[PDB]
Design a protein around this ligand. Structure first.
Ligand SMILES: NS(=O)(=O)c1ccc(C(=O)N[C@@H](c2ccccc2)c2cnnn2CC(=O)NCCCS)cc1
Ligand SMILES: [Zn+2]
Length: 257
């Protein structure tokens, strides 16, 4: 029932998921002047060289590229994290217009889109158990701006034709998520939540400072997707972002001086 319309969008979610008004909700606005460098942060390790992608799925919210997480293959370690976090999927949030689409904002600036690489803490054995823990997940967030094309994104753009409507999937093997990273791994980190229902407060957020650039044509292909299922009235999959939530008693830490 929840979605991103006037009748079922983020302002309505709290009626089915009261944690929507919780103490560690995401996303947030990152006030870069209030964020503090934290010398206790260890180097961030993004280790994706043995990633094994499997499939791409339109789940009615976004599209997810899913990975084989049955072994340590593609993992996130270091930074604010304790232990090893395994990549399970990535997806994006985007706008109807280039001036909006990201979930996190930076000094109130909205980006055209935001990539979420989702990882779970291997100490909990599987994703389902990890989402019952306050340090169960780590999401690596990457902003997208419109400018030059991102070559590493093109294979995603070109399969979207095949998963236009909710519940469609396609084989998506041998995709290398390293092609979606910016040059610098400088980040902000804070404790938060899933940004969609069930909005569970399990996430260590790691949001990169440097955006990647994608072309107008690339983001336009995202906006041709549908929220609805085949045969249903066409609802373009656009503006699938939750706005910034109250920071409450949290501190955002920076990895850079
Ligand atoms: N935006 S985010 O990175 O913060 C984020 C990351 C992961 C999930 C997620 O795994 N949600 C699934 C889940 C299954 C079991 C327990 C809890 C959560 C779920 C539940 N119903 N559908 N899904 C799939 C889901 O919503 N896919 C993520 C695409 C966001 S537009 C949601 C948001
Ligand atoms: Zn997300």
């Amino acid at each position: 029932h929840w979605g991103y319309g006037k009748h079922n969008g983020p302002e309505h979610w709290h009626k089915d998921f009261p944690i929507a008004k919780g103490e560690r909700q995401s996303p947030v606005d990152i006030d870069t002047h209030t964020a503090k460098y934290d010398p206790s942060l260890k180097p961030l390790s993004v280790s994706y060289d043995q990633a094994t992608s499997l499939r791409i799925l339109n789940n009615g919210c976004a599209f997810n590229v899913e990975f084989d997480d049955s072994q340590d293959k593609a993992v996130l370690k270091g930074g604010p994290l304790d232990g090893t976090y395994r990549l399970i999927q990535f997806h994006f949030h985007w706008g109807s217009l280039d001036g909006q689409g990201s979930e996190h904002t930076v000094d109130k600036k909205k980006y055209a889109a935001e990539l979420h690489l989702v990882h779970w803490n291997t100490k909990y054995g599987d994703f389902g158990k990890a989402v019952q823990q306050p340090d169960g997940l780590a999401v690596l967030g990457i902003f997208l701006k419109v400018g030059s094309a991102k070559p590493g994104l093109q294979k995603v753009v070109d399969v979207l034709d095949s998963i236009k409507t909710k519940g469609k999937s396609a084989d998506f093997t041998n995709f290398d998520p390293r092609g979606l990273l910016p040059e610098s791994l400088d980040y902000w980190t804070y404790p938060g939540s899933l940004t969609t229902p069930p909005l569970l407060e399990c996430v260590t957020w790691i949001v990169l400072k440097e955006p990647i650039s994608v072309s107008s044509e690339q983001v336009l292909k995202f906006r041709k997707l549908n929220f609805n299922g085949e045969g249903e009235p066409e609802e373009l999959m656009v503006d699938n972002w939750r706005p910034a939530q109250p920071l409450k008693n949290r501190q955002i830490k920076a990895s850079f001086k």
